[PDB]
Amino acid sequence: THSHGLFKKLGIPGPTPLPFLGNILSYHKGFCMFDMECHKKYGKVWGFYDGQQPVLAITDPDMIKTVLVKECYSVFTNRRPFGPVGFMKSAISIAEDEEWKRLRSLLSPTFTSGKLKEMVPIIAQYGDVLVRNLRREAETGKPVTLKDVFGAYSMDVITSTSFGVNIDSLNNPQDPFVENTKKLDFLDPFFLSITVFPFLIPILEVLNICVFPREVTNFLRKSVKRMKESRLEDVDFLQLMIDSQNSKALSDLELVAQSIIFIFAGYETTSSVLSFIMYELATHPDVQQKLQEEIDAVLPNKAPPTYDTVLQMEYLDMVVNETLRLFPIAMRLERVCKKDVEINGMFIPKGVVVMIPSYALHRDPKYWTEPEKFLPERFSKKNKDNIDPYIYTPFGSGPRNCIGMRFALMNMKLALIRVLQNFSFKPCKETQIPLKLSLGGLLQPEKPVVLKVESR
Ligand code: HEM
Ligand SMILES: CC(C)(C)OC(=O)N[C@H](CS[C@H](Cc1ccccc1)C(=O)NCCc1cccnc1)Cc1ccccc1
């Protein structure tokens, strides 16, 4: 509470913090509601406290460009630490300063479009698996829980595109590989405690207690070392990383850490976003029909999608983009200010976490007409030019943006094309309309999305 005078000293408005807790009791309706309320009450900048940690929210696009792009290497290089991580210190998304810059360099060629284009046939084959599993539920007119069927698909693409492991996870839900990979919210009892007692992280570190379950990581560390020495010697991210350390080059533990970070990144996020898209499509049947029409036009006779035909589909892009406006699953972007700086006329002291409230800026009425409405036309080739890339930031911006952005969009778009070539999706009576968001620390629905699936 001796850090609680900072924003008052700088003349920055904000909610008044409680001793020890700072402002965290205000998270009782989730990050997103608190961000919106603060933006409304206070304006273009505000300040609050995760316990003793000061967080400065910013909403000026010039200033957001300074933090995310212009001054990224110099000042704003790292996100805030969040819990004991053990050897996952070395994952690209956790690493800092020159170690991150090194790993970002080492893994960037892995995510080029050319490498992605070679991944498309592997991503395509489990679209086919996705359809047959869905068709089994559509012929037995039982409502479908999207998270399970899409989770199984996302998991299927990951195991294949990252290790070559080919599993029908939905029907082998309990293969040892699928078990570890699925398993284990910054507003759960643990992480709030860490925010009130962030002195306790080094405690857990010397104790080898890790927020990554130690059994999953132990399983994958040894799984990788088997794969590595079965390929060595006798198309996936592991090969791409194995070829990279065939040179400063990627250590062996370092390689495992990135493998682990890739698996989750796209397990729950791809799965989650595909469900938000199928919700919107089901409650906006005209948007759905217009997409089936575009897909049939570009790929007649249920022609298999290809890398090039996917980038041909403009309405598909508009649907994806608009969904990520309403549900940017990151919610906020964050960088720690490593040096006293003054950017766009505002002094920022060292150690402040600077925060871009994406969810709140994606639903700002001052940049978006009817911002709560699902309106893909916002992203039409005509109107797309009028959208500020520092207000709409579903993948971040700048040198620390989502390295997997192009893979994710291609992964999800192949997912939707195949599924819409063969099915229409319709609300049930058990479908939650309007969808309510979870009051927790994740951007996800209050209730899981359930929809009726009919065969075309
Ligand atoms: C719909 C899917 C996804 C969305 C919306 C998304 C969004 C984001 C966002 C908002 C960030 C923070 C960017 C920033 O701080 O400016 C991020 C970081 C990151 N994402 Fe994604 N992401 C997605 C999928 C993926 C996938 C499939 C991968 C596959 C490897 C991935 C890997 C990463 C990595 C490694 C980082 C950290 C980048 C760094 O620290 O250098 N993400 N993502
Ligand atoms: C989004 C937020 C900050 C509100 O709560 C978080 O969950 N904490 C993020 C870590 S998320 C997840 C956690 C994890 C899981 C397994 C191993 C290590 C870490 C993770 O693997 N993260 C990196 C890849 C990723 C995640 C989501 C989207 N794209 C890529 C901090 C963070 C959040 C989003 C992007 C980058 C970092």
Swiss-Prot record:
Polyubiquitinated in the presence of AMFR and UBE2G1 and also STUB1/CHIP and UBE2D1 (in vitro). It is an enzyme of class 1 (oxidoreductase). Changing G30D: In allele CYP3A4*7. Heme binds at C402. Changing T159S: In allele CYP3A4*16. Expressed in prostate and liver. According to some authors, it is not expressed in brain. According to others, weak levels of expression are measured in some brain locations. Also expressed in epithelium of the small intestine and large intestine, bile duct, nasal mucosa, kidney, adrenal cortex, epithelium of the gastric mucosa with intestinal metaplasia, gallbladder, intercalated ducts of the pancreas, chief cells of the parathyroid and the corpus luteum of the ovary (at protein level). Changing L333F: In allele CYP3A4*12; has an altered testosterone hydroxylase activity. One of its GO terms (cellular component) is endoplasmic reticulum membrane. The keyword Thylakoid does not apply. It is found in: Endoplasmic reticulum membrane; Microsome membrane. It is linked to Vitamin D-dependent rickets 3: An autosomal dominant disorder of vitamin D metabolism resulting in early-onset rickets, reduced serum levels of the vitamin D metabolites 25-hydroxyvitamin D and 1,25-dihydroxyvitamin D, and deficient responsiveness to parent and activated forms of vitamin D. This is Cytochrome P450 3A4. The lineage of its organism: Eukaryota, Metazoa, Chordata, Craniata, Vertebrata.
